[PDB]
Amino acid sequence: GNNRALINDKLASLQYNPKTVMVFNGTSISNIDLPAEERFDDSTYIVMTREKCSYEADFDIAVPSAYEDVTYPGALLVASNDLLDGKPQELAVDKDRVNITVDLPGATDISFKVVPTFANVRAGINDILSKWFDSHGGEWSLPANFQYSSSLVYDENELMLKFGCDISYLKQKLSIDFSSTRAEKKSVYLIRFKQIFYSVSAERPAKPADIFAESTTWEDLARAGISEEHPPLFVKNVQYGRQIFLKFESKLSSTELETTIKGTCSKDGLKIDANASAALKEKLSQIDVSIVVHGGSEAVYNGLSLNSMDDVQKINRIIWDNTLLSRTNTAAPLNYYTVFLKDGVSAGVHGTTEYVAEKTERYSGGEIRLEHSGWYVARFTVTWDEISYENGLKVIRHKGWEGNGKDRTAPFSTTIPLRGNARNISIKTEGCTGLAWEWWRTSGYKVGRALVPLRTVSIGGTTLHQTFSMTPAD
Amino acid sequence: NNRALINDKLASLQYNPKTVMVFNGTSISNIDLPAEERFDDSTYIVMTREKCSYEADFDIAVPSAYEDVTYPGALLVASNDLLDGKPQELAVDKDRVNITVDLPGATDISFKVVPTFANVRAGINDILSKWFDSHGGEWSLPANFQYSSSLVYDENELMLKFGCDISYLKQKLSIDFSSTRAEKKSVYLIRFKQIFYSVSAERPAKPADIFAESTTWEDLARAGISEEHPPLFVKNVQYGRQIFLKFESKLSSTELETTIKGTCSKDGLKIDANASAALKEKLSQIDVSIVVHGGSEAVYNGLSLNSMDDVQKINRIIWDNTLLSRTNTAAPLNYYTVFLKDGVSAGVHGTTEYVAEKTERYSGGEIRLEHSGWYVARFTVTWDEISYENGLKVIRHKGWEGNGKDRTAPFSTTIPLRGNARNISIKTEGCTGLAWEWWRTSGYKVGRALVPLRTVSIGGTTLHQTFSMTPAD
């Protein structure tokens, strides 16, 4: 009982700041040279603007695939930045008994006391699990009820921070490599469906040293890594369940990828249907789908397409599968929560990471049709502004139709084609009355109109009754 | 004999036409301009700045006080100072030119006299009293009408969009943009212009014909003539009336433009008597100045837009004297020049840089949660909160304090959010009492906008959970 009393004193005297001992490290971008850029796709004008952003959120710690046997409820760890990177460092010493509590929904919480070891905690969990589904028939079922998350992802750090997942696992299965992806002109959108089936918690002993066997000494802890820079931690809680990831990769722009997916996919699945779209499909055809399913079932799929109605229904089925939880069909560990052993303060961290958001806007070209059928001489004036980005400067050039002011007779009809960089259209029509005190009469003067696909201005009538109609009548 | 020699001096007087007069635009430094934010009260305001430039043809206005030297058939020394409203008179003695008055509907009636401010003015008005006498009409329609409007950043943007005389407007409207920008005021300008008639002059083929036989080449070098400063001929002058309306405000550029564009048109100002209280308080922050340049001049300061009598007064100023009459003198507006030697246009293209200021306003809002059903529910509300700090758009994920907590009916509460909240998601769950399916999701809405009021109502029973959201979407 003398060794524990030394561990308590050395623990209580171990001075460290809970907030700064582990720290998320995100991407930094350090450069303001993000000028707008432009191009044309025939009459279509495509402007791409870039903005530096950072995303801030509580960092959820995934249970790594390769360290499940070290992150079980009641495990001990040495705090280390390498825990945030998916490599938690076991604190391997002998321990005394701890209360482990399984929280299953609709059931009263059953607990059991054992020395926290992977084999002991696992057996205890699987026993309580046996009694629960050995009491719902053989072993039974849980319908899909998912938390939903979606986002474009710039790099591995935005991914980890928004989705709280094990990058290492997801890199294996979904084949995520952002150097290859940006080297091509590809963007990535990611959806996650997440369902927690049950949780398992562990109570930290009032006096912390009580977690150790009586034989363990302070000197064993220091040899394993413990110190003020690496205080000990206690796995307070692990969640178990099922997780589905959908990765959408495209050469389309970020903005067009996000818009296409946001309109065809949601928390309800994929509602993509036939007879109300046609260029949507040539977009969709450019989107490669990958899927990984983890917990319950285990599956990965690659090479699916959203044109096919039967790929869409295969996806929705994967998503809305009921899971038959049993001894032969387990749940996967998803996230775990650590507390500092010294006092029981959380070791959850905040994370920040910077990224470059790219916004693409497409502005379609258009036409102005002028038609004169009136019994008089008429002139048309058409002007507009043309937008250009030349280095980091929005250049605005006033322009004019070559025919402005010229006299026009009898049946006259022309089309003025405009590209998507034209704004601020002004149109004026005048008809010569033939009478000296009112020689030119203005039948229409529309300024500041927008470029629409087809604008038609018709004048007709006679010298003293001049008609004007514009379509659309903006 | 001086004609032989003056004519050959303009042999190949070395100058490029396009280079001898060049528009001097504003240039902006390329120091970074970061987004700026502030809050009024729960309303969130983001201000962004973009460096721009505007290019167009530069219409040269007739400067007040240089009308004596920019009449048709007058002679000028070329020079960057002309673009700035100080054209340099070339005062030598001149022969006779054919000057042609162009009245709308009239035959082009010409006369040949010695180019002089007094000569052409008398010659034009003599032609005017003749066209008026041969008409029972007191009034005729102008040859042309033009309506323009824009925000203005500095004097150069103003000169280029409007082809105005900067100096006349600076004095009459007391414009100064270094003071205006300091006080955080924005400026919207509108112009109405009527050209009643033009008055052109034909340039003789043998250019020297324009000088009396007594003037020599040395009388001209003494007037300032060079290769750097070739001679100009005022070929055509437009006469009429012009009015400027200057709208000045502590409102933002975006909001000033949007308010004026919606209450002004080529027909004048329209304010609906049934105006929203929001719209009326913005109009109450707009001060209106007016400069009228015609046969009569006038300047108005401190007009307002807050009553229909204020709007009437302004529309009456705009449309007063917009028809040519015997009693309603036209005034010179714009003038066009050729190089005396060969006759090509001395007209220049212009470019100027400015900083455009785009302001967006994001009102606050509430989410009301209501629970009426016969079961235990929990709500989950999250959003992102936007900030601009340094040059960084910062997005902080936030959650309602009450998330995940069991709620028993009746429950009601309100979550207030300010306008930097975006991307709202709301999840409502109900406990069925069945171990199979303990928790059932009854509504899950993500990526929603912050509206002034979003109501989420849940009711029903454990196995029939009802859900309504208003606005649905």
Numbering used by the authors:
A (entry chain A): 2 to 475
B (entry chain B): 3 to 475
Give excerpts from the publication.
The cholesterol-dependent cytolysin (CDC) genes are present in bacterial species that span terrestrial, vertebrate, and invertebrate niches, which suggests that they have evolved to function under widely different environmental conditions. These proteins all exhibit an analogous protein fold to domain 3 (D3) of the CDCs, which forms the β-barrel pore. The disruption of this interface allows the formation of the membrane spanning β-barrel pore in all CDCs.
We further show that the CDC from the terrestrial bacterium D. propionicus (desulfolysin [DLY]), unlike PFO, exhibits a high level of pore-forming activity across a wide spectrum of temperatures. DLY was crystallized, and its structure was determined by multiple anomalous dispersion to a resolution of 2.3 Å. Despite the relatively low sequence homology between DLY and CDCs from Gram-positive bacteria (∼40% identity with PFO) with known crystal structures, DLY adopts a similar overall shape, topology, and domain arrangement. Most CDCs have just one cysteine residue, which is located in the undecapeptide motif, whereas DLY has three additional cysteine residues (C54 in D2 and C166 and C266 in D3), none of which are in a disulfide, although C166 could not be altered without decreasing pore-forming activity (E. M. Hotze and R. K. Tweten, unpublished data; also reference 4). The D3-D1,2 interface in DLY differs substantially from that in PFO. Consequently, there is a greatly reduced number of hydrogen bonding interactions present across the interface, with 12 protein-to-protein H-bonds in PFO compared to only 6 in DLY. Interestingly, the analogous loop in native DLY (S66 to P74) adopts a conformation similar to that observed in PFON197W where it does not contact the glycine pair analogue (G296, G297) in DLY.
